[PDB]
Ligand binder design. Structure first.
Ligand SMILES: Nc1nc2c(ncn2[C@@H]2O[C@@H]3COP(=O)(O)O[C@H]3[C@H]2O)c(=O)[nH]1
Ligand SMILES: Nc1nc2c(ncn2[C@@H]2O[C@@H]3COP(=O)(O)O[C@H]3[C@H]2O)c(=O)[nH]1
Ligand SMILES: Nc1nc2c(ncn2[C@@H]2O[C@@H]3COP(=O)(O)O[C@H]3[C@H]2O)c(=O)[nH]1
Ligand SMILES: Nc1nc2c(ncn2[C@@H]2O[C@@H]3COP(=O)(O)O[C@H]3[C@H]2O)c(=O)[nH]1
Ligand SMILES: *[C@@H]1O[C@H](CO)[C@@H](O)[C@H](O)[C@H]1NC(C)=O
Ligand SMILES: *[C@@H]1O[C@H](CO)[C@@H](O)[C@H](O)[C@H]1NC(C)=O
Ligand SMILES: *[C@@H]1O[C@H](CO)[C@@H](O)[C@H](O)[C@H]1NC(C)=O
Lengths: 438, 452, 444, 444
């Protein structure tokens, strides 16, 4: 019992919402059961009262000692002060449902006996179940598993409610009176649940309804079964289309560029290299383009995400001490991440150079024209002698080939000058370090 | 000389008052035609209700002869041109066919055949127009989509029940095992039993459940196979509409979750530290829980520039008149300033601008609480609050001073601040056409620089 | 004579060859399996067989003299067309579909011209104006063909097993109730509908082959049902995709106006604007409509839309031809609400407007008096855009222009104008001297 | 030797190990539950079980020699591969699928089903390798349906054997009757019952006892979930199979509604619609940079020098300038598809684009009369003087000749500004192109 409950990094609070879910699920799944079936007998009534008192104690402990302790954000600032948390929960819209649910109609047991229709206000605390659903769907690493289990749970719950309504209608017409009603001969909940399954699921094969109340019942129940089965198909389609969305988008762009390379008659080796790039990009990043993702975020989280992945790689090179931090942040926001297949040429000796290469998760070699001089492992630098020079400047000194699936981080010279025009003093000191180092 | 307005609320109250007797005419005209105890038993009630439906049909002709229309932007308000634009429509032909006086033949046959009133179903366009106006007007569009779909398939299930009872009356009551049973038996001869068993048969056939007795004759085989193929099309539209309602009831939730899983996939690929990972994740859950996850430029993209400007004024101007600097300025500069603002939300602990950097942005605080700190850590010098302002001294680049364009202090956020980013270049191109306002902003910058 | 494959005569031939292909599918499996349709109406099936083979050899000639495109040009050399036809596989399918192997079981190669039926369905789907209604009709035709072929397969399996030896099979056809051909076809159609829609009022099977056929038929009916539901679900999701996108835009706007606490007058003004944009069908914007087109068709649509409106004003008629082409390429239209001020007094105007289907009026400062009422075709914004001597103001609005109704203007921005005004120098000296004449016309 | 997991030898092993995993699943539940299929064909099951255990042992020996990518290149060290195998949970599963639990009991070989990962890996590799992904997704769904139908048939026969044959009306009937006592009748009636239960049809006899009621409730509830997943996974396949056609129909109908709103004349309307029909018939509906924006510059340049360097090697201005500059040129080239008769540029329009003809036939038409001076075929080139803009020319600030298409030409365009950004890094070739343009302008 902390002074203030964080409710995002609190597994204990998730276990408490599991406890209010279990009390609320006891009420929803055992209100109509005791209300319709004769499972509230005289030698089980203390067991039903013991678990219903445990349910009311969990409801009351929720309304008193946990839900007035929740850390919430008002006006930007988070709140720790416990009287202010108590004022926020007391002036919330959860408290209307909670104090409307915990109203003791169990003191009305002296008027009309032990009747669980008095306790049918305990099902009004649905917001604890939906808070538990949202909190479990947010903590889970695979939300489609819990969406499938929740759609199964709603399906089994509507079949349980329909089994209780069929046993009410059987007791209302009389048990064993007509051919449609329940006969009486087996386990009452199992045969009534079987009828609710074969009606709700729109199967049929049951006895045909005989009187007019049974025809109205079977007609409304078959209509609700059509819409329950249609909602079940729609929920499974939503889970499927939101489960294979990234895979279907990757496959759609892959077959789109295969259709382009077959439409313009491109050979099998180049098509195999494009397909090898696509399979390695899916096996590494599990996404098509990371720049398309990072263009959606704010600039501050973009800055921190670029810093935590590249600032160690920039600072582990001995060259980059003297550069200033605003230019370093802008060049880390203006890095481009490309991939090189094994054997590809990143720097051909004699071509023009316009790129500073920051290597990350790869291993390229320099060939000065097949001997290995120094195998550049991850974190190293090359392409630094054509970035500092104006115009053509210097050509490449050696053929640089990528040995493995190298994932270079590239810094183009045009984007470097587009950074540099907003930083004159940085341009000056950068040119000075350029002249001293070369 | 009254002209109604088709975008108003009087026209929508008339669309409700004419989608009542159109729906009555569809439902109870097929039922009174096929069942023949409804027409003969409740004859005074149907005389009263058909008088009401015909009076509302005449008034719908008089209202459609006064619905204004748009040419050159303005509402047309002259009665001769309204009557001419009504008369050159097909809807006038459908309305004057829907008011053909077949009550002469209805009194000729002995007030027993409402088969002659089936041209009263010809105002289906008023019913479709009411459902269209409600589905754009209401606050629960998915609940109205399911109410509209349930009304459409209940029209079809009711019409097919009346068709099955008319087919059974044509073949003979209780000659086969498929037709409706013998109505001289007093259990099946009641009208509630007739209609509810015919509706039960029609629901079972048109939703492809089939617990019905199997047909005997070829006309019954043919009607049952036509009803089963119509029923598999009706079940296909039910599953398609409820699947579309489920896919559009959490479309924004699914796109936010796709963004969350893509960020989590990127951060497990590049392997960021867990404090930054939970910072970005709690930052995105805060943006979803405070309903601000979608960017203001993408929400307001569909709007015209005039309504974008009025929305930007009515949001940002009550913040931008709490700044103690911009109080002597004009309407065009305030309009362009609240146009060129872009809000970015910061998390706690996040740095806005660090000391010793080149200033390229100006910030105006709105629903936030900040703190200028030193280089050591969390030392609150000034707590910048709601409506206050910073960043206005290192974007103007006033040379000849001791500071220049260097942001003089480390600024961090205390809470979940929601600043208004106002860029340097977005200010200098918001002062390019206004040189007197430019030198007024330079003289107030000289005042606040003489303070700094 | 070369039949052009995108013409209207070729689609009339696609209709006239998709008729006997559909006949050959439907009635060839029915006449093969039922043996009383084939044996009773033998003159009618000989007449329709003669007409189907005549249309099949005429389709061989028409596919021999149809054209194709090399280098964008229509080929009309008949030996090249015949060689391009003979190299394809559809000539092999047409010469297989016209082997006179002549019991219509020997005529079952006539179903091999299925590509003309698929071509007719695709050409109608990209030519008609009710594509979802045609796709519903196409899906209903496909499932009626499968229901029919399953009825014929059930009657063939019943005839192979024995008529009325089991309870599963078709009953004993020597009884005159079950012996008629109408009863045979409609009971086999009723059985195949009950099986392939997975309903099951059918009698249960007895032998292992009947059990296995009903298993295979129920799995095929499950996949048929799944394909029907998937086609109608994608069609319902595409029939209102534009409506759902516009409602998502409306709901995001209303969520923004709830979150940023926008006042009720502006909330009902934006709600009135979205109601107007709904009721007058402008739910998609022209800036995203005109992105997918090529630049040549975009320029030609800009000519044919804007030039007849732009030459309605006589003082803007003195302009150069290709420069007017570029000007109507860069004219960007907007729509204004009633009561919306186009320009107040104390705002420096950076836009020129040409009124197209609207009605604007000039008013005083906070006073609705009508000096003049601008109309369709007239224009304004011309004295504060070319930097002329004003009345000690330069570029300032000297009049308040409201909107009387839902007016629509052609917004031509100042810097957007000038960045292409700089490239044509002498023509722009002519335009700036014309603007000096307009300023002389209004007020020195 | 180290087996590379991206090669084709590893996919041949994925087929040769997804064969006995599928045998072990299917026939191990059927041999366990049916008890005459195990007893009769015992020599066949001894041969197939020895073969499946030999393939499982070779699968362990292959997974101990399957390479894996560490820092971009494959590990070839066999001790490193063996330690990376031993630290996996798949080593525990691939050792647990080989324990000697042992003729009369095939339930002691139920640990052979634990190698499901090889079967799911083979289905994933076939769906990423085959040319028909929706056909393989239908085959995968039908195979999962048939495994579920078969396992439920075996479970119904085991439950009926446990309860008693023919004691109830729900269970499998009496085994000493020789009609029901044969193995083909046993398996096909249990498969018929499992199909009719799991597809939720329910024409089978209803349950009598309580465990039969509970098994049929659980069976209907498994079947409605499985049959909702199947209908959803077919409808999602159909919707994401025709999403591209639906997007093209949305573009076509939005541009149609825009033209019928803006009152575009019928000739331009028919020209736009015939251009869209041509684009849909020749499948150039996508945009080139929109479908290659995700590839890196090296592979974009590889495709671009593969398809454009053949037409760009024979040109007047870029003959032997620089190989990397031709790479940057074919990266910065950009397509536009033109209509027949469509003028590319008249007399009077200022030039800013160079065009390279590729699969088209153009014409230098005159002003008034349609006379073809010389037809420019594919590989030819124009726009050169108006993208070089040299001083000392006639310098009329107009293009000097009309260019009009004869057929559907596919011009690959090039802007002068994109030329200058290609030409910044090599200024000697800049001066070379200026002098070549001067030569061709003087020798026009
Ligand atoms: N030639 C060469 N370049 C090296 C070596 N080690 C690091 N580098 C860098 O690798 C480079 C590849 O590109 P550059 O020609 O631009 O310049 C070269 C050097 O900066 C080496 O041993 N030889
Ligand atoms: N230096 C400074 N800036 C302050 C103070 N209070 C508010 N601010 C704002 O904080 C700033 C941080 O960025 P700037 O340098 O851009 O400009 C500074 C001011 O606008 C203060 O006491 N000192
Ligand atoms: N100032 C002024 N503008 C007028 C008058 N009548 C029509 N107009 C137009 O109204 C205008 C409003 O915008 P502009 O300043 O752009 O230019 C002005 C003129 O084109 C008039 O009497 N005075
Ligand atoms: N004037 C002219 N242009 C030609 C000729 N042959 C090809 N072209 C190209 O056609 C052009 C049309 O546009 P440009 O003026 O831009 O430049 C011209 C040339 O590049 C020719 O004989 N004369
Ligand atoms: C219906 O019932 C009446 C009286 O019960 C009887 O005379 C008549 O024959 C019955 N009709 C049929 C078709 O059986
Ligand atoms: C079918 O009926 C005929 C006469 O009605 C009879 O001779 C024959 O045996 C019957 N066949 C079967 C299989 O019942
Ligand atoms: C099955 O048949 C045998 C002999 O025909 C009989 O003894 C046995 O009781 C039957 N089984 C049942 C369950 O009746």
């Amino acid at each position: 019992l902390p002074n203030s409950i964080d409710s995002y990094t609190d597994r204990l609070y998730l276990l408490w919402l599991l406890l209010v879910t279990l009390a609320y699920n006891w009420n929803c799944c055992f209100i109509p059961l005791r209300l319709v079936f004769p499972y509230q007998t005289a030698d089980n009534i203390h067991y039903w009262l013991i678990a219903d008192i445990i349910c009311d104690i969990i409801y009351l402990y929720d309304m008193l000692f946990i839900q007035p302790r929740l850390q919430f954000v008002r006006g930007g600032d988070i709140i720790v002060d416990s009287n202010e948390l108590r004022k926020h929960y007391r002036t919330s819209t959860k408290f209307q449902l909670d104090v409307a649910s915990i109203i003791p109609f169990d003191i009305c047991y002296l008027f009309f006996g032990f009747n669980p229709m008095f306790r049918a206000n305990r099902m009004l605390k649905y917001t604890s179940f939906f808070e538990f659903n949202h909190h479990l769907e947010s903590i889970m690493d695979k939300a489609y598993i819990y969406r499938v289990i929740r759609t199964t749970g709603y399906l089994l719950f509507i079949l349980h409610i329909n089994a209780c309504v069929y046993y009410w209608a059987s007791n209302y017409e009389g048990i064993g009176t007509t051919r449609w009603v329940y006969d009486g001969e087996g386990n009452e909940y199992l045969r009534c649940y079987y009828w609710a399954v074969r009606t709700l699921i729109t199967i049929g094969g049951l006895p045909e309804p005989q009187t007019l109340f049974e025809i109205v019942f079977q007609l409304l129940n078959f209509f609700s079964g059509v819409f329950v089965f249609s909602s079940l198909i729609g929920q499974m389609r939503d889970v499927i289309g939101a489960a294979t969305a990234n895979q279907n988008y990757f496959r759609a762009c892959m077959d789109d560029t295969i259709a382009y390379m077959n439409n313009y008659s491109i050979p099998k080796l180049v098509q195999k290299r494009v397909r090898t790039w696509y399979e390695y990009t899916w096996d590494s990043q599990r996404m098509l383009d990371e720049s398309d993702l990072l263009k959606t975020l704010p600039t501050t989280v973009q800055l921190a995400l670029a810093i935590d992945v590249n600032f160690s790689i920039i600072s582990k090179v001995d060259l980059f001490k003297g550069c200033d931090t605003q230019m370093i942040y802008d060049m880390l926001l203006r890095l481009k991440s490309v991939l090189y297949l094994p054997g590809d040429f990143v720097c051909k000796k004699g071509e023009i150079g316009k790129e500073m290469y920051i290597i990350k998760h790869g291993e390229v070699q320099v060939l000065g024209g097949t001997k290995v001089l120094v195998t550049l492992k991850a974190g190293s630098v090359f392409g630094e002698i054509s970035l500092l020079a104006a115009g053509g400047g210097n050509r490449r000194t050696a053929n640089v080939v990528a040995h493995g699936f190298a994932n270079l981080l590239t810094l183009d010279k045009k984007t470097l000058q587009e950074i540099l025009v907003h930083y004159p003093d940085s341009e000056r000191i950068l040119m000075k370090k350029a002249r001293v180092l070369l | 000389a009254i002209v109604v307005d088709p975008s108003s609320n009087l026209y929508y109250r008339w669309l409700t008052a004419i989608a009542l007797p159109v729906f009555y005419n569809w439902y109870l005209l097929i039922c009174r035609a096929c069942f023949d105890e409804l027409q003969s038993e409740y004859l005074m009630l149907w005389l009263v209700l058909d008088y009401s439906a015909d009076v509302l049909y005449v008034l719908d002709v008089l209202v459609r002869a006064r619905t204004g229309f748009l040419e050159q932007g303005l509402m047309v308000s002259d009665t001769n041109r309204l009557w001419q634009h009504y008369k050159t429509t097909t809807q006038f032909k459908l309305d004057v066919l829907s008011l053909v006086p077949t009550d002469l033949a209805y009194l000729k046959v002995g007030t027993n055949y409402p088969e002659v009133r089936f041209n009263r179903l010809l105002k289906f366009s008023r019913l479709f127009e009411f459902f269209d106006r409600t589905e754009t007007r209401t606050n629960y569009p998915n609940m109205f989509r399911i109410g509209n779909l349930v009304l459409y398939i209940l029209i079809i299930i009711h019409w097919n029940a009346c068709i099955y009872f008319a087919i059974s009356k044509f073949i003979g009551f209780g000659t086969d095992s498929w037709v409706y049973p013998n109505i001289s038996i007093p259990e099946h001869g009641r009208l509630s039993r007739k209609y509810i068993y015919s509706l039960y048969w029609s629901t079972l056939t048109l939703t492809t459940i089939g617990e019905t007795p199997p047909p005997v004759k070829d006309e019954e085989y043919l009607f049952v196979v036509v009803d089963f193929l119509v029923g598999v099309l009706i079940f296909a539209t039910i599953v398609g509409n409820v699947g579309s309602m489920i896919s559009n009831m959490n479309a924004s939730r699914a796109e936010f979750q796709a963004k969350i899983d893509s960020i989590k996939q990127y951060m497990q690929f590049r392997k960021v530290t867990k404090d930054l990972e939970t910072r970005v994740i709690r930052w995105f859950d805060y943006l979803w829980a405070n309903k601000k996850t979608v960017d203001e430029k993408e929400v307001l993209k569909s709007l015209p520039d005039k309504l974008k400007a009025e929305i930007a004024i009515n949001v940002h101007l009550d913040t931008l008149k709490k700044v103690r600097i911009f109080q002597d300025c004009e309407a065009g500069l305030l309009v362009e300033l609240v146009l060129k603002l872009r809000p970015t939300v910061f998390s706690p602990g996040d740095y806005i601008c660090k000391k010793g950097d080149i200033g390229k942005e100006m910030y105006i605080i709105n629903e936030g609480k900040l703190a200028v700190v030193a280089d050591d850590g969390v030392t609150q010098f000034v707590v910048l609050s709601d409506g206050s302002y910073f960043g206005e001294i290192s974007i103007l680049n006033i040379k000849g001073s001791k500071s220049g364009n260097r942001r003089t202090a480390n600024i961090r956020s205390i809470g979940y601040s929601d600043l208004f980013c106002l860029s340097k270049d977005d200010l200098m191109e918001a002062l390019t056409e206004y040189p007197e306002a430019k030198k007024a902003l330079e003289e107030k910058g000289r005042q606040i620089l003489m303070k700094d």
